[model samples]
Target: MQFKLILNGKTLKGVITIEAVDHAEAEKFFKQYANDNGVDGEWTYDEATHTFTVTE
Candidate 1:
């Protein structure tokens, strides 16, 4: 599955999407993404598709 994320800041914006095997995997991937991008929280999960969507 593919996930889409949107990051909003005071004067910055970011968008990211990734593919994962399952929900757990997507969460893991999101954690790594957060670590790599210096983002935290504001992420939502879609159980119907086992995907993730992020917003700031």
Candidate 2:
């Protein structure tokens, strides 16, 4: 699956690929993304067809 993330600062984005069994897992996956990109608490997420989108 591919997950896309938008940063709050409007300057960076995180595009990640990982395996997830459910939406909650997907959220957990993106937590790593937040850590990697230095963002916290403002990320929004969506999942469909084993793919997801996250925006902050």
Candidate 3:
């Protein structure tokens, strides 16, 4: 499935496209990506649109 990852930050905002088998797998990818990039925030997933919105 395709997932939309939105990084909503106070100073910067961006979006990322993620491909994964499921939401759990998508979260793994997102956590890794965020860790590697030093991103910190709260996140929520929307099943309707398969989007992950992170607020910073």
- The lDDT leader among the candidates is 3
Superposed Cα deviation of residue 24, candidate 1 (Å): 0.9
lDDT of each: 0.68, 0.57, 0.88
Please, what are the lDDT tens digits per residue for candidate 2 over residues 1-56?
Answer: 44455444556554556666766776776776668766644534444444444444
Q: Candidate 1: deviation at residue 29, Å? A: 0.9
What lDDT would candidate 3 get against the real structure?
0.88
lDDT of 3 by residue, 1-56 (tens): 99899999889889999789987898899889889878889989888999888898
Between candidates 1 and 3, the TM-score winner: 3
Note the residue pairs that clash in candidate 2. Answer: none
The order by descending lDDT is 3, 1, 2
Determine the backbone clash count of candidate 2: 0
**Residue runs of model 1 more than 4 Å from their true location after superposition:** 46-56
Candidate 1: RMSD to truth: 2.5
Question: Please, what are the lDDT tens digits per residue for candidate 1 over residues 1-56?
Answer: 77666666445687667777776776787788789977755767666655455555
Q: Model 2 off-target regions past 4 Å?
A: 1-4, 13-19, 46-56
- Per-prediction tally of clashes: 0, 0, 0
